[PDB]
A paper describes a structure:
We resolved structures of a fully inactivated state in which the non-polar end of the N terminus plugs the internal pore in an extended conformation. The N-terminal methionine is deleted, leaving an alanine that is acetylated and interacts with a pore-lining isoleucine residue where RNA editing regulates fast inactivation. Opening of the internal activation gate is required for fast inactivation because it enables the plug domain to block the pore and repositions gate residues to interact with and stabilize that domain.
To increase our chances of obtaining high-resolution structures of the N-type-inactivated state, we introduced two mutations (E12K and D13K) that enhance inactivation (EI Shaker) by dramatically increasing the association rate for binding of the N-terminal inactivation peptide to the channel. Analysis of this construct using mass spectrometry revealed cleavage of the N-terminal Met and acetylation of Ala2. We reconstituted purified [name]-EI Shaker into liposomes, injected those into oocytes and observed that the kinetics for the onset of inactivation were indeed faster than for the WT channel. To validate our assignment of residues in the plug domain, we collected another dataset in the presence of an additional N-terminal peptide containing an acetylated Ala, increasing the number of particles in the fully inactivated state. In this case, we observed one main class (also 3.05 Å) in which the density for the N terminus within the pore was improved, making residue assignments more accurate, and we also observed an additional nearby density in the chamber corresponding to a second N-terminal peptide. The cryo-EM map for [name]-EI Shaker with additional N-terminal peptide also has continuous density between V4 and V474 and P475 in S6, and between A5 and those same two residues in the S6 of another subunit, suggesting that those interactions stabilize the inactivated state. First, the structures of GT Shaker and [name]-EI Shaker with free peptide show the sidechain of N482 in the S6 helix directed towards the N-terminal inactivation particle near Y8 at the innermost end of the pore.
Author numbering:
A (entry chain H): 12 to 20
B (entry chain D), C (entry chain C): 84 to 91, 96 to 194, 216 to 252, 277 to 298, 310 to 327, 357 to 489
D (entry chain B): 84 to 91, 96 to 194, 216 to 252, 277 to 298, 310 to 327, 357 to 488
E (entry chain A): 84 to 91, 96 to 193, 216 to 252, 277 to 298, 310 to 327, 357 to 489
F (entry chain G): 2 to 13
The structure:
């Protein structure tokens, strides 16, 4: 979980 | 569903700062208006020497822009760039107000405001709400007119704020003052003195987190219903099992399946029933199974609500 | 395993809307049929002026299409585009029904319908199931013909529905009606009265979420077995430790190691045992270790189960 | 907000090992200094044969470099390359000390440093802290000069360390020794003998993980406050509900709503109250609802704190 | 740290199925051997008509392959392709066994079960389960017949151990040491307790148990952090609850250590049971203890969870 | 259980 993480994009 | 163009008039080349794009003119003809749709807004970018269209802008983001023409109505942001840069890219070509709006969803009266003079009004309302809650809790105490005066002052402030203001916020404001005027079979009295607690929900107007929680509940009502259904099924099953474990035993701990219902709950939620000795071996096995199944059936639905709350909380900030 | 062609007949160029691809004809001739596999379906896209194949479609998704030819049978969607674009991307070239189907796995009869006259039957069935559950839980009460008539009406409805209909749903329907006909040693009677509760599982036919839970359990049987095994190991170890901590003290709280099993359980799942005073310091240390290890062992395997539930829930919607 | 250039003098081509980039010179001259900003530092890479700029480096990472000129101040790392290659690539062109620094935020005196054989001092300090904690706990026992001597030795060591040393660490160091010197109504005495426990926080200077916990608390104070607010709302609501469910029954289990508060807590956190029999059916329903809502309100805000702690721990 | 080449002999062009790459020959000369490092293994791919290097393979994976030449020793897989294709791409160019191992790091029938030892294993599992059952049953109050089965199990265990001849062997030795010991009562109690270690022999036959052991070995640090946090919380909250109740007659807690257990069953949400004789301040301290316990358990455990998940998926 | 969290799969 990060900012603009691979899960989100 | 969208329509894609098919080949066989003339082909054109688009040079997005060295990345050459070649498409049929019919594809550019598909969407009227727009910078690239009509010659009027794109003639300035034509290069007479090279017969090419030059757009000295971001190269990786032009693929989605071309795919809009390619797919004829589909705009999806590729996962290689932040949303900030892509928002500016679509504005450059002016794809259309409807197109941009569709992608947006893809991801006195001074009281309802926040100014220098509205802040004191808000803090006064918060203090009054907290005072009303405190007076409620203390008037329920066994040690106890002095409470009635504070209660009626809070009610006058609440109704004054409601009248000045005039969804769900107004409904909560109304319900917070209905019971006071109701007082002006003891079951109805108990119900109204219970619904007096709804004044605590007036903090939603002044707390940002509480509104986030409300939005999360509204979004995940389906998951809440699924969790309640799973809990009900588990409670019924394990109550039946634990009752029939002691059915053949004398001096049964559980008189009936509904009696065991509470027990099942405090085992599915891992709260704990307390005294557990008079239960035999089979009841203990059923209890262990109930504990495991409760852990599972609580851990399954919650993460969806967790994700909804996280999304709402991070979208707020 | 897949076979990749090796170089040294003639080379051809593929132009995906400006993105030039060069590939040996032997690689293109590996796969028969298909838009590019045979000259019949790809001569229409030939450009006599430039001797090039022009494909005015999505640039980024052609890499996987060529890699399917390159690897000679290996096709995987790169993580740069959504699934909708890639699904339609393959249909353009018609790589083959078997190739597309293989990629899909990579990611009267008036009752089983949704007609206007079928929803009433479904609502009657679910109402009857709920009524049967209620009648069961009320007939088990100490305060109690009136229940037998309702039970036999529910059984008649269940048998009528089963006969009209005529996996696992049919097994559940059979089990929900076996015990009533069975009644027409006390251990067998207790077992049949217990298995009567399986009528609650008939809601799976009408509940979408319950089928999702069943599919999740079927998928994660292995993780469930792992969790049960870990629980058994922990229970045995900690029950033995806590029993041997009180071996040397008179009036031992635990008479034997099996006697302690229940305690261990309600400490691993954090349910709680209740009274804990007659336990010495070593027993308390063992209990603290048991609580920590139980938290860890119940936390370890459930991510997989909840991820499977998430996947099934999202696939359903 | 950032400003981007607009077209209409001469355009140039950049060849990043075969990936040709064509950009307007006005874009290149937007940022002074830098390898590409001035002709002095970029004439070396010019190719007279083809009039092209050759930069034999990582192709995928040049898009961010050009976009920085394109956006005129916005430099964002695309998610296609590791952090190591991007940090080295930007240093090649010397984008600017302020520019690189801005991107960094996007993602005796022997005691403080445990080097030069001073780790012995640290282990002695840890041993003294543990001994002080043990002596405190043992002196609270009913079975009990021998404790006072050890306690005052620990206090002398603590004050010697604090004085030779001379933030939150210093505040904790001072608080760990205030109560001993204070003792040289009984409510104040109870408060000081309670705050004497703050010597356990002295391990912060030596334990790396506890500093991570402190940083996580500082970062997620807002989420902790939100969790406390949710718990308070739920406790008040369910305490009122359960109390009013027992109003009409004689020998009520809960005498008042505040009395029920504690119960609500042990049902919201799923700890357990214990004896629960004298509660009627309505109270049992309220308790089940309280347990479920407590599970919900505990599970909602804890992932943020968990993520913050994980990020800090794995960054350390 | 790795070395990158610097410009000024002749530059060569690489055509990866239409994706043109241009690099300095010195960059390819940096690594000896390899398909592209030496002319012997790459002259076959030369195109005399175009003077180009043609490599009809996956285009997106050549960026990392070239970056290995570019970085002079750093090979990182970009997030655009699965790991299966990258392993095939690197094998084509034969970068080097040492280089590929970097990404790699990124009678006697008992171990290898082959048909007949597929039974021996089931007999061993059955014997282990039987020994556990005999242990638990002989601890019952109602109970030679148990000793015979115990000695048969020990005979089988020692036969297997001596035929076989890490940690599995250590556990096997421990599972039979106490039986041979029997051939102050504190030592007797200790050996009868350590007799339970026979339950760990299932590690040889259970795949999940080995995964759990590997997870513990990997996350020993996180386990220690969790234990430290729990200890700090227990000490703090036990001291607080003791001092919140010392001033009342007939105090529930006699001393801070006496409260330790309570603190534990409040941090882990197990529950203590009876809670009435504690006053308002004790109840507030207990609520704070419960909340802090939820936080301190939810903080480090997910790291161990992540380690276990990774090991479980790596096994399968 | 109050964890109810997946998070990143972990190191490599
Ligand atoms: K509990
Ligand atoms: K619990």
């Amino acid at each position: 979980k990060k900012r603009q993480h691979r899960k989100k994009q």
